[PDB]
Amino acid sequence: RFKYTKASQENIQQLGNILEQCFVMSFGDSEIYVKGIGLENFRVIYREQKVAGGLAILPMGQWWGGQRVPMAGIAAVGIAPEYRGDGAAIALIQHTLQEISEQDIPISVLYPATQRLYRKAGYEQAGSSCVWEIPTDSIQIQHASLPLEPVVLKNNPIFHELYQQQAQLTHGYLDRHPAIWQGLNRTLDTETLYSYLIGDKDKPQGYIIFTQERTRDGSILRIRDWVTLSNPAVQSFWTFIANHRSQIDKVTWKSSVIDALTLLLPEQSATIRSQDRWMLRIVNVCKALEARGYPLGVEAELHLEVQDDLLATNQGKFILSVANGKSEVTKGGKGELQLDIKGLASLYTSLFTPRQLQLTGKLQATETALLKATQIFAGESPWMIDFF
Amino acid sequence: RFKYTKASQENIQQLGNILEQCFVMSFGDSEIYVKGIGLENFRVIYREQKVAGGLAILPMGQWWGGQRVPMAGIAAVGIAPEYRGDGAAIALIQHTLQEISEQDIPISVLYPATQRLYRKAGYEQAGSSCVWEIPTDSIQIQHASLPLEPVVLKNNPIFHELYQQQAQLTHGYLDRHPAIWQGLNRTLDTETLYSYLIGDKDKPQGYIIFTQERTRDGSILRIRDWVTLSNPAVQSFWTFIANHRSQIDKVTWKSSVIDALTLLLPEQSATIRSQDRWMLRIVNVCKALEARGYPLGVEAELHLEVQDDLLATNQGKFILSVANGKSEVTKGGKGELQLDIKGLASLYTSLFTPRQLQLTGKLQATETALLKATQIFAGESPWMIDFF
Amino acid sequence: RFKYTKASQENIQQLGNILEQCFVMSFGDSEIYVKGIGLENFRVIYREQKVAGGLAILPMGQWWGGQRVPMAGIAAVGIAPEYRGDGAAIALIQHTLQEISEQDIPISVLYPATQRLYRKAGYEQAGSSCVWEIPTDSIQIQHASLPLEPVVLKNNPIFHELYQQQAQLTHGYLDRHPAIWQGLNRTLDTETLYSYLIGDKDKPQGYIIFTQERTRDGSILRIRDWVTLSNPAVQSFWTFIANHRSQIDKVTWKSSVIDALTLLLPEQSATIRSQDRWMLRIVNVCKALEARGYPLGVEAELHLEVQDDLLATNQGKFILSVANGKSEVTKGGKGELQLDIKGLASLYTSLFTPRQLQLTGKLQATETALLKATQIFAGESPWMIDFF
Amino acid sequence: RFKYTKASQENIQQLGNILEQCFVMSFGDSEIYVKGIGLENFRVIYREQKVAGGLAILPMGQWWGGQRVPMAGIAAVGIAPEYRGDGAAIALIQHTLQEISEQDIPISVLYPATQRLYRKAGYEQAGSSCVWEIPTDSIQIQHASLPLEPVVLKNNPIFHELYQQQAQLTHGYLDRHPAIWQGLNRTLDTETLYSYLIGDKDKPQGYIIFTQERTRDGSILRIRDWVTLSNPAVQSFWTFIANHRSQIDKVTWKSSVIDALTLLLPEQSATIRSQDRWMLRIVNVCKALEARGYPLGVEAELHLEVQDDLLATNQGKFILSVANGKSEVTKGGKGELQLDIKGLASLYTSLFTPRQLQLTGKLQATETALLKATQIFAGESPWMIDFF
Numbered sequence A, B, C, D: 001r002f003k004y005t006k007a008s009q010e011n012i013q014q015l016g017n018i019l020e021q022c023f024v025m026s027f028g029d030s031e032i033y034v035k036g037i038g039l040e041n042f043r044v045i046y047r048e049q050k051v052a053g054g055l056a057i058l059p060m061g062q063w064w065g066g067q068r069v070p071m072a073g074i075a076a077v078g079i080a081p082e083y084r085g086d087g088a089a090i091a092l093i094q095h096t097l098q099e100i101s102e103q104d105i106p107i108s109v110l111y112p113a114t115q116r117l118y119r120k121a122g123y124e125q126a127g128s129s130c131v132w133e134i135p136t137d138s139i140q141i142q143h144a145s146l147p148l149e150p151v152v153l154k155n156n157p158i159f160h161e162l163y164q165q166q167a168q169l170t171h172g173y174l175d176r177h178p179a180i181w182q183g184l185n186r187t188l189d190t191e192t193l194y195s196y197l198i199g200d201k202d203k204p205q206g207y208i209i210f211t212q213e214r215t216r217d218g219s220i221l222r223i224r225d226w227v228t229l230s231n232p233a234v235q236s237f238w239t240f241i242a243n244h245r246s247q248i249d250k251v252t253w254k255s256s257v258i259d260a261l262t263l264l265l266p267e268q269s270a271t272i273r274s275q276d277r278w279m280l281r282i283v284n285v286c287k288a289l290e291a292r293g294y295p296l297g298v299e300a301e302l303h304l305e306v307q308d309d310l311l312a313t314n315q316g317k318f319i320l321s322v323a324n325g326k327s328e329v330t331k332g333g334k335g336e337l338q339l340d341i342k343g344l345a346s347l348y349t350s351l352f353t354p355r356q357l358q359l360t361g362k363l364q365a366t367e368t369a370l371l372k373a374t375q376i377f378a379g380e381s382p383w384m385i386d387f388f
C-alpha cells in the first residue's frame, strides 16, 4: 500500500510542492530548501502510484557526555493533506527508522509538530530549545574585554572550529550537517546577515551571528547562533549587544532553559519568548549507550530491561557497565530497571532524572538501580541551539 | 546614623504603613500580612529618630540534597521612599545577615525586587520558580487511577505530611515557616479556596490547592500548591484538571523550569507564563556545607578559597571532604577552587555547574578541582513552589 | 449508583457550593441565585451517599408559531469535579428528562457548556442568541416619535404585558419563568438598573432595560431586554440610544442573528460580539407537534419516522396532519421522512430547513415529504433574548 | 455638468488610477483588475472635460427561489477625491441604473462602502455575506467518506458544474460573471492556490478552493470558495480541514449567517469574524417578480403599490399573482401593500419578513396582504459566497 523510496528527479518536485503546502512556505521557497539539504537526503512515501509525502534524513552527530554519537536528524515530515489520517506518516517514520538502523546510526532526533505520531514510533521528549528575549536598554554592561570584528560566515572555518568546541562541551549539541550551516547563512533579500568574531586578532574566543529588522512592535536583533568559550567572550558579547540600545529595542537569542548568560545581567530583565522540546529515538540500544560519554568517578553496572515494539534487536535485557567515563554493554542480566525505548531516550539525554522518570511512570527500578542510573546519566540539562 | 532593632508595638504600625506603600498593598492589607508572620519576626531600621523601613526574617529550613538546612527567609524589604538612595537598605540587609549569623543559621534566601542591592551583601541567583500555564482543553487525559476528595486545608496535618515528603525529595524546597502555609490558606472575600487530596481513602498520594476566577481574558484556575508522590497521583492530577475544561479556559501551576508534569501531556501545549530566580546567601560556609546532603558514590576532597567582604569567618581556605553522602569541612588546604561567597551560593544549590560558573567568571579552578566540584554539587535543578 | 432526588434543606447548601464551584461564582452568590429560582426547582444527583451535583428545572413556556408550548428550561447543570468523567451528568439529564416527560411537558431547552453531553440525551441545536454591539456615535438617528419615561421594573405589569406581545410574535421566545425576570432585575451593588417605557403616556409601545459601566476599554451601555412593537418604538429606541453618545462609547443588545433593528441605521456599524445556539429536546413528539402553531395556507400530511433511544414513546411512525394553522398527530403511516429525535428538534424550530437538514444528514426524505416538511416548518429564524 | 460614457482606450488608464486611489490598491494592481473584468464593462463619469470617476457593471445572474434572474453587479465605484461632495457618485449611479433598465436587466446588486449613497438611488439591504473562523484543532471530525483530489481550477468545467448546482439551490447565489471566477483564481506571487474536488473519481460531490499563509498571529487557511452537495461531502470537507491541525492554527470560510456546516461540529467553536449586507435594486418591478421562483403550494394574489422616484415605470399599482411556483404580474389592483422600491428589495430577497418590514416601517399592509406576502416571499435567508 505504502512504498518507501529515495527521492529522485522523477519525484522531487512533487515532494517539494507537498513540502511547500505542508509547511506553508511562500511559492518556490521549497527549491532553495531542498537544494540546501540535497536530494540524496530526501525520502518519499507512495500510496498506490501517487507521491503521498516524504521527509529528509540528516546524517550527522550529536554531542552526549562529550562524545560524538552518530545521529540522524529527521526534517520536513509532510503528508499531502488528501492522504492524511490513513497511516501514511507512521509508515514513513517506521521505514525511515529501519533505514537508519541499517546504517548503524544509533540515535535520531527531530522537533515534532505533533508528539502522538512520533511516540508511536518510539521517539520521546529528550532535550530543550529556548528563545530568550530582552530589552536592549536593560543590559547595561560595558566590559569590553575583547574586541569584535565583522567577518564573512560562508565556509569560514573559524566558525566551525569555535562551534565544535562549544558543541563538544554542551550535552545535546549538534555536530552539524552542512544543511544546518546553510540555513544559518540564509536570509531574505530583505535582510543582511551579520557575523562577528569575539576576541583579539587570531585568538578568537567566540562569535555572534544575527539579523536585524523593524517590525510593527519596533526593532529587533535576532541572534541565530553564538559561541562564548570564556568569560571575557561573555562580557564582550553582552557589551556588544548593550551597545545596540539606541538602534534596537529588543534582542533575542537561543539558549538553554536554565540560561547561564543571564547570570551576568544586573537584573532579571530577560524572559523566555518560546521553548520547544525535541525528541530522540534510541535506534540501537547497545551502540547508543557505547557511543555516549559518561561522568568520571562513576563505576557501576546497570541491568536494564527494554521494550521496543518496532526494532526487535533493542527488546530485551542489557547490562550497561560504566567505568572511567566509558561503557560496555552486554546482553542479559537481571533487568533491575525496566522501561520502554521511550523512557530510555529521556534517561539517556539527562532531560529527566531517574527519580523523575519513575514518578511519571516511564521506568520501574529498585532503589539501587535508581541510584546507579542517577550516577550514570547525570549531566547538564540537554539542549541545542539549532532547529531543523 | 541607621539603628537596627526588632519591631515593637511602638513602631509596627508605621512599618506596616511603609510596607503598604512599598508593595502597593490595598489600604489595611498590611495588618493581615504582619499578623500572619508575627511581629517578633519583623525588624526595623531607623534613620535618626524616624522609622525608615524594615523587613521580616522567616526562620525555617530548606531541603538540599535531601537534608534540611536551617534557613532564614527574608521577606517584605521596604524603605520609605523619602529615605531611599542613602544606603538604608544595604545597612538593613547587613545588620540582618549579622543577626542570622549570630543565630547559627547558615543560609538565607529571598526573591529580589532588584539584584544589585542583594549582591552587595553577598546574595546570588541560586534557584528557580516558574509559573506554567495551559489551555484546559489541550490536556486530554482521562486516567483517573486515584480518586480526589475535597478536604479542609487549615491546620490539616495530612497536607504537612505529604508536603514534607515532596520537599525532602526536591532540591531547593522549603521546610515551610508557618507564614507560608498561612499565605496559602489566604484568599480574597471574593474567592473560594479549593483543596483536594489525591488518593484512595486513608492512602493519600498527593494534593491540589487552588482558586478559580473569571477575568477579562476568560476563566482561570490557579493552582497555588500541589503534591504528586507517584505516577497514579500525576495521572489523577491531570485527569482532574482536564475535567475542568467546560468551566475553565486556562490553568496555571508552579513548577520547575524543566517541568516533569508536562512529560505526560499529549502535546507541548503548556507555556511558561513567568519565571523568577531567587537568591541565596551563604551565611556560614562550614555549617552550610556540613548541613547539606551530597550524592552517594562520591568520595572527594575539594580545597576551596572563599572571599567574603562582610562576614570575615567565611573568608579563607576550607577543605570540603565528601564521602558516603556526607561532608566534613576543615580550615586550610590549597585553595584550588577560588570564588566569592556569591559564586559559592550558585555552586551550592546546583543552579549552575562548575563549568558554567567558570565560564561566567564566578569561580577559578584547576581541572581536577572542577571535576571534584562537579561530582560533589551535581543535582536536580533547584526550585521551590513558594514565593515569599 | 446514582440516585436522583428533589433538592431539600438537607442538601441545598452542598449543591449551592457545587454550583459556585462549577460556574466560578464569587463566594456566596449562589444563595441569591438559588433563592431567585426556588429550592423546589432544584434537583440533586447522589453518588453513593454523597451529593455529586445537580441542576434546576424551569417550568415555563416557549412561543412556536405563535402558540405557547409548555417548556422545561434546564439551568445550572453542575457535577463536582471529583465526580466527573463517570457518567454522573448524563445520568442526571436522563432522570430529569424522564421527570419532564412524566409532567407532560413536551419540550425542554438549555444553553450547553458542552454539546456532546446533551446530544447523548437527544438535545440538539435549535435556536439562536446573539449579542450585538455598536459605537454610539455611529447611530445618528434623531427621530423621537415617542417619548421615553423611566419606570420601576420590579413586578411592574406593564413590562410583562409588552413582553408577552413581542414573545407571542417571535418564534422561539420564552414565556418566562419568574426567575428570568428576577435575573433581569438583578444587579451588582456597583450598578444601577435603568428601565424606560417607550410611548405616549398610557399607550406604551415598547421598553428598554439596561445597565451602564466604565471599563478599561471605555464606557458601555448594556441593554439586557427591550421591546419594540411598532416602527415609532424602533425610531424612538435608536434616538434614545444615539442620545447617549457623549456619555457612552459602545452599546450592546441581544437580538436575532439576522437583526432587523440594524435595518434602520445609516451604516452597517453594528457587529456581532458573540453568539450562541441553544438546544432543544423533543420530550413528547405528539404533544410537541400538536402544541405548536403552523403557517396558515398549509394543508399537508407528513409521515414521520422517529428514533428515540431514551424515551420509547417517541420511537416510531407518526402522521403529522396540518391544516388551518393547526396539527393533529396520529400513530402510523409510511415514514417518508426519517430522523432521530435530534433531527426533529432542529426541524421543529425552523433553525434549519429540511433541505439543510438533509444535506447535513439529520434527516432522509422523499422529495414530496421534503416539500411538505418545508411548507409545515417554515418560519422566522428562531431566537430568544434570554439566557438561563 | 456630468457626462456618463463607456470606458475607452482614451480614458481607462485615468480611471484605473482613480480606482487605485479610491480602493488603496498597490501601485499597478488596477491593471490586472481592469483586465480581469474587461474595459467594455467599465463606465466613466466626466465633470466638465475631466474624468471624475467610474465603475464596472457585471452582467450576470442571481438565483432567487431557484430561478436565474438576470442581474447587473455594480463594482469598483470610485470618484476621485477632488470631485467628491458634489453629486458625482449619485449622478453616476442613476445613469448606470438607467442603462441597466434599458438592457432589461431587472435587478442589480452591490456591496456598499456607504449605504446613504445607494439608498438615494433605491438600493437596499437585501442579503448577507459572513466570514466564519475556527481553530483547526477544535474540529475533531475524522469521517472521510469521500476522497479529496487536487485539481487545477483554471477553466475547469467541473467547478462550474458543481457551483451552478449549489447556486441554483441557494437563495441569493450568483450565476457568476467570468470576473468572479477570475478573482478566485487570482493570488499574490507570494501565495499558492489550492483546489480540491471532493468525491470518488468521476463522481464529484463538492470542492474546496483555498490559500494558506503565516501571519503575526499564526497560520491561517482561508477558504475562498467551497461546494458540498451531500452529507458525505460535508463530512469529507470537515475531515480534510481537521487534518490541517498540525500545520494550521485557524481556518476561515464564507457562509450564511446561520451557517449549517457548523451543525456537524462537536462544539460551538466557530465564530463570526465579519459580516456584510449587500444591497439590491429592483430595476424593473414586473420583470424582477416574474423572473423569480416562488414556493410551491402557494396560490395568492398580492396587490402592491410601489413608489420609485427614479424609474417611473416602477411607480404604481401591480398585482402579483402566484401559483404553481410561478408568478404573473399585471398593472392595477387595490394596492393593499404599499412600499418604496427599497422596501420591495428586502421583501423580494426574503432577508426580512413582511412582519419585520412592517415593524421597521418599510411597508404598510392589511393583515391579509401581510399573510399573502409572507407566503409568497418565504425562503431561506439570502446569501452569497462572493464579494465583488
Ligand SMILES: CC(C)(COP(=O)(O)OP(=O)(O)OC[C@H]1O[C@@H](n2cnc3c(N)ncnc32)[C@H](O)[C@@H]1OP(=O)(O)O)[C@H](O)C(=O)NCCC(=O)NCCS
Pocket: A022, A023, A074, A075, A076, A077, A078, A079, A080, A083, A084, A085, A086, A087, A088, A089, A090, A091, A111, A112, A113, A114, A115, A116, A117, A118, A120, D243, D244, D245, D246, D247
Ligand atoms: C501530521 C501530518 C504528517 C499528517 O500525517 P498522517 O498521515 O495523517 O498521520 P498517520 O495517519 O500516519 O497517523 C499516525 C499517528 O499520528 C497521529 N497524528 C497525525 N496527525 C496528527 C496531528 N495533527 N496531531 C496529533 N496527532 C496526529 C495520529 O493520531 C496517529 O496516532 P493513533 O494511531 O493513536 O491515531 C501532516 O503533514 C501535517 O499536518 N503537517 C506537516 C507538519 C508536520 O507534521 N511536522 C512534523 C515535524 S517535520
Ligand SMILES: CC(C)(COP(=O)(O)OP(=O)(O)OC[C@H]1O[C@@H](n2cnc3c(N)ncnc32)[C@H](O)[C@@H]1OP(=O)(O)O)[C@H](O)C(=O)NCCC(=O)NCCS
Pocket: B022, B023, B074, B075, B076, B077, B078, B079, B080, B083, B084, B085, B086, B087, B088, B089, B090, B091, B111, B112, B113, B114, B115, B116, B117, B118, B120
Ligand atoms: C529598593 C528599596 C528597598 C529602596 O532601597 P534604598 O535604601 O534606596 O537602597 P540603598 O540606598 O541601601 O542602596 C544600596 C544598593 O542597592 C541598589 N538599589 C537600591 N534600589 C535599587 C533599585 N530599584 N534598582 C536597582 N538597584 C537598587 C543601589 O544601586 C545600591 O548599590 P550601589 O552601591 O552599587 O549604588 C525600596 O523599598 C523599593 O523601591 N521597593 C520595595 C521593593 C523591594 O525593594 N523589594 C525587595 C524584595 S522584598
Ligand SMILES: CC(C)(COP(=O)(O)OP(=O)(O)OC[C@H]1O[C@@H](n2cnc3c(N)ncnc32)[C@H](O)[C@@H]1OP(=O)(O)O)[C@H](O)C(=O)NCCC(=O)NCCS
Pocket: B243, B244, B245, B246, B247, C022, C023, C074, C075, C076, C077, C078, C079, C080, C083, C084, C085, C086, C087, C088, C089, C090, C091, C111, C112, C113, C114, C115, C116, C117, C118, C120
Ligand atoms: C461537564 C460537567 C457537567 C461534568 O459532567 P460529567 O459527569 O463529567 O459528564 P458524564 O461523565 O456524564 O459524561 C457524559 C458525556 O458528556 C461528555 N462530556 C462531559 N464533560 C464534557 C466536556 N467538558 N466537554 C465535552 N464533553 C463532555 C462526555 O464526553 C460524555 O460523552 P461520551 O459518552 O461520548 O464520552 C461539569 O459540571 C463542568 O465542567 N462544568 C459545569 C458547566 C456545565 O457543564 N454547564 C452545562 C450548562 S448548565
Ligand SMILES: CC(C)(COP(=O)(O)OP(=O)(O)OC[C@H]1O[C@@H](n2cnc3c(N)ncnc32)[C@H](O)[C@@H]1OP(=O)(O)O)[C@H](O)C(=O)NCCC(=O)NCCS
Pocket: D022, D023, D074, D075, D076, D077, D078, D079, D080, D083, D084, D085, D086, D087, D088, D089, D090, D091, D111, D112, D113, D114, D115, D116, D117, D118, D120
Ligand atoms: C464615496 C465616494 C464614491 C465619493 O462619492 P461623492 O461624489 O462624494 O458622492 P455624492 O456627492 O454623489 O453624494 C450623494 C450621496 O452619497 C452620500 N455619500 C457620499 N460619500 C459618503 C460617505 N463616505 N459616507 C456616507 N455617505 C456618503 C452623501 O451623503 C449623499 O447623500 P445626501 O444627498 O443625503 O447628502 C468615494 O469614491 C470614496 O470615498 N471611496 C470609494 C469607495 C466606495 O465608495 N465604494 C462603494 C462600493 S464600490
